[PDB]
Design an enzyme around this catalytic site. Structure first.
Site, PDB file in Angstrom:
ATOM      1  CB  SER A 190       9.277   7.948   4.242  1.00  0.00           C
ATOM      2  OG  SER A 190       9.514   7.859   2.849  1.00  0.00           O
ATOM      3  N   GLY A 191       7.315   7.597   6.692  1.00  0.00           N
ATOM      4  CA  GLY A 191       7.121   7.574   8.134  1.00  0.00           C
ATOM      5  C   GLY A 191       6.059   8.560   8.589  1.00  0.00           C
ATOM      6  CG  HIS A 221      11.428   3.026   4.269  1.00  0.00           C
ATOM      7  ND1 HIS A 221      10.301   3.662   4.738  1.00  0.00           N
ATOM      8  CD2 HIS A 221      11.796   3.693   3.149  1.00  0.00           C
ATOM      9  CE1 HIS A 221       9.999   4.671   3.940  1.00  0.00           C
ATOM     10  NE2 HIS A 221      10.891   4.713   2.967  1.00  0.00           N
ATOM     11  CG  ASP A 280       7.991   1.018   5.571  1.00  0.00           C
ATOM     12  OD1 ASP A 280       8.748   1.353   6.505  1.00  0.00           O
ATOM     13  OD2 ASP A 280       8.067   1.482   4.414  1.00  0.00           O
TER      14      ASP A 280
HETATM   15  O1  LIG Z   1       9.096   4.772  -2.353  1.00  0.00           O
HETATM   16  C1  LIG Z   1      10.361   4.825  -2.418  1.00  0.00           C
HETATM   17  O2  LIG Z   1      11.121   5.083  -1.446  1.00  0.00           O
HETATM   18  C2  LIG Z   1      10.827   5.450  -3.790  1.00  0.00           C
HETATM   19  C3  LIG Z   1      10.410   6.804  -3.348  1.00  0.00           C
HETATM   20  N1  LIG Z   1      10.194   7.805  -4.361  1.00  0.00           N
HETATM   21  S1  LIG Z   1       9.714   9.182  -3.510  1.00  0.00           S
HETATM   22  O3  LIG Z   1       9.445  10.407  -4.405  1.00  0.00           O
HETATM   23  O4  LIG Z   1      10.880   9.344  -2.563  1.00  0.00           O
HETATM   24  C4  LIG Z   1       8.300   8.721  -2.670  1.00  0.00           C
HETATM   25  C5  LIG Z   1       8.422   8.222  -1.296  1.00  0.00           C
HETATM   26  C6  LIG Z   1       7.320   7.830  -0.550  1.00  0.00           C
HETATM   27  C7  LIG Z   1       6.022   7.921  -1.149  1.00  0.00           C
HETATM   28  C8  LIG Z   1       4.880   7.542  -0.435  1.00  0.00           C
HETATM   29  C9  LIG Z   1       3.605   7.632  -1.010  1.00  0.00           C
HETATM   30 CL1  LIG Z   1       2.283   7.144  -0.030  1.00  0.00          CL
HETATM   31  C10 LIG Z   1       3.418   8.120  -2.372  1.00  0.00           C
HETATM   32  C11 LIG Z   1       4.531   8.520  -3.161  1.00  0.00           C
HETATM   33  C12 LIG Z   1       5.867   8.440  -2.585  1.00  0.00           C
HETATM   34  C13 LIG Z   1       7.026   8.822  -3.291  1.00  0.00           C
HETATM   35  C14 LIG Z   1       9.246   7.346  -5.373  1.00  0.00           C
HETATM   36  C15 LIG Z   1       9.635   5.986  -5.983  1.00  0.00           C
HETATM   37  N2  LIG Z   1       9.979   4.983  -4.927  1.00  0.00           N
HETATM   38  C16 LIG Z   1      10.337   3.653  -5.466  1.00  0.00           C
HETATM   39  C17 LIG Z   1      10.322   2.257  -4.891  1.00  0.00           C
HETATM   40  C18 LIG Z   1      11.694   1.599  -4.514  1.00  0.00           C
HETATM   41  C19 LIG Z   1      11.513   0.156  -3.951  1.00  0.00           C
HETATM   42  N3  LIG Z   1      10.102  -0.208  -3.491  1.00  0.00           N
HETATM   43  C20 LIG Z   1       9.583  -1.582  -3.566  1.00  0.00           C
HETATM   44  C21 LIG Z   1      10.407  -2.684  -4.093  1.00  0.00           C
HETATM   45  C22 LIG Z   1       9.844  -3.998  -4.135  1.00  0.00           C
HETATM   46  N4  LIG Z   1       8.552  -4.281  -3.700  1.00  0.00           N
HETATM   47  C23 LIG Z   1       7.767  -3.254  -3.203  1.00  0.00           C
HETATM   48  C24 LIG Z   1       8.225  -1.903  -3.114  1.00  0.00           C
HETATM   49  C25 LIG Z   1       9.259   0.922  -2.941  1.00  0.00           C
HETATM   50  C26 LIG Z   1       9.362   2.283  -3.664  1.00  0.00           C
END
Ligand SMILES: O=C(O)[C@@H]1CN(S(=O)(=O)c2ccc3cc(Cl)ccc3c2)CCN1CC1CCN(c2ccncc2)CC1
Ligand SMILES: [Ca+2]
Lengths: 235, 51
Positions: free
Chosen positions: A185-186, A42, A88
């Site tokens: 990410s990644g 992603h 992902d």
């Molecule tokens: O993650 C996102 O990019 C966004 C990213 N942000 S982040 O600070 O950029 C972030 C990014 C990666 C991370 C990785 C780790 Cl392991 C821990 C904390 C993180 C935090 C947090 C909230 N999400 C929401 C969400 C936006 C939509 N999503 C889903 C929708 C439907 N079903 C499953 C998932 C995933 C994250």
């Protein structure tokens, strides 16, 4: 990376950074070899044309062992989808081969059964990146690592708000303020066994950063191993 | 057998192949004469921190 430590000289040699055209690091990656990089499927959306930096531990003070490489081809996963963030995982083939020196070496790719058996049953794991150090904050300058414990898949599924498929796993803490944030990410998730590391996860997604009652979601690398192979055999 | 005991006392990958234990390594390594240890073959082996 909320909390964690700082990656010391040649301590996180497999880290990688995808930088945009404005030369900004947006995502992370993991060095598998001299030609291939492992990233989140992603991250191939947060830019139009990007490159991959390696050997950088501080984004601002030109150390010396840095090196930029150009993407020859991108291998995004077929089944991936933004709607559910399932699958992902993608692999980048570089044009010029990464030259291993200090702060530049690849992470080992484990066998699946042995991995799920001994690597994912291990207590902790390591995540690293240049990502935000406090949800609403500015990205990071230095490269860092956070020893994040594996979480019980049940809790994981309970604590979540999104279907935690079999291609993903949780890792982190329930209360502590330590958990990969935006920009990681990644990035690489590696487990340590006998002074030698192995790729086990790909910073995928999460509900905020280090949030109370929420974890960090990673891509189960073991669940894509075979894919990763014929992806380096090119396909 | 019993990669359950102490990873077959291997250095890396461990396999309860048939009745006994069979160790193996990642790419870039080679199994030592004792069929347990993994030795590098190049100056930059995967998984090792460049120190
Ligand atoms: O993650 C996102 O990019 C966004 C990213 N942000 S982040 O600070 O950029 C972030 C990014 C990666 C991370 C990785 C780790 Cl392991 C821990 C904390 C993180 C935090 C947090 C909230 N999400 C929401 C969400 C936006 C939509 N999503 C889903 C929708 C439907 N079903 C499953 C998932 C995933 C994250
Ligand atoms: Ca630098």
């Amino acid at each position: 990376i909320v909390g964690g430590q700082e990656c010391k000289d040649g301590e996180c040699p497999w880290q990688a950074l995808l930088i945009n055209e404005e030369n900004e690091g947006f995502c992370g990656g993991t060095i598998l070899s001299e030609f291939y990089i492992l990233t989140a499927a992603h991250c191939l959306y947060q830019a139009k044309r990007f490159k991959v930096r390696v050997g950088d531990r501080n984004t601002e003070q030109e150390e010396g062992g840095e090196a930029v490489h150009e993407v020859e081809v991108v291998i995004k996963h077929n089944r991936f989808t933004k709607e559910t963030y399932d699958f992902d995982i993608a692999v980048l083939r570089l044009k010029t081969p990464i030259t291993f020196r200090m702060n530049v070496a690849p992470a080992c790719l484990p066998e699946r059964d042995w991995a799920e058996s001994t690597l994912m049953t291990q207590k902790t794991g390591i995540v690293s990146g240049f990502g935000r150090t406090h949800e609403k904050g500015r990205q990071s300058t230095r490269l860092k690592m956070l020893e994040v414990p594996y979480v019980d898949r049940n809790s994981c599924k309970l604590s979540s708000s999104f279907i935690i498929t079999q291609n993903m796993f949780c890792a982190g803490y329930d209360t502590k303020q330590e958990d990969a944030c935006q920009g990681d990410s990644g990035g690489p998730h590696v487990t340590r066994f006998k002074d030698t590391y192995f790729v086990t996860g790909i910073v995928s997604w999460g509900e905020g950063c280090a949030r109370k009652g929420k974890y960090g979601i990673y891509t189960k690398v073991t669940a894509f191993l075979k894919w990763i192979d014929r992806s380096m055999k090119t396909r | 057998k019993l990669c359950s005991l102490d990873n077959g006392d291997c250095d890396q990958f461990c396999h309860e192949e048939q009745n006994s234990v069979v160790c193996s390594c990642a790419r870039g390594y080679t199994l030592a004469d004792n069929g347990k240890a993994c030795i590098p073959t190049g100056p930059y082996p995967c998984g090792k921190q460049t120190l």
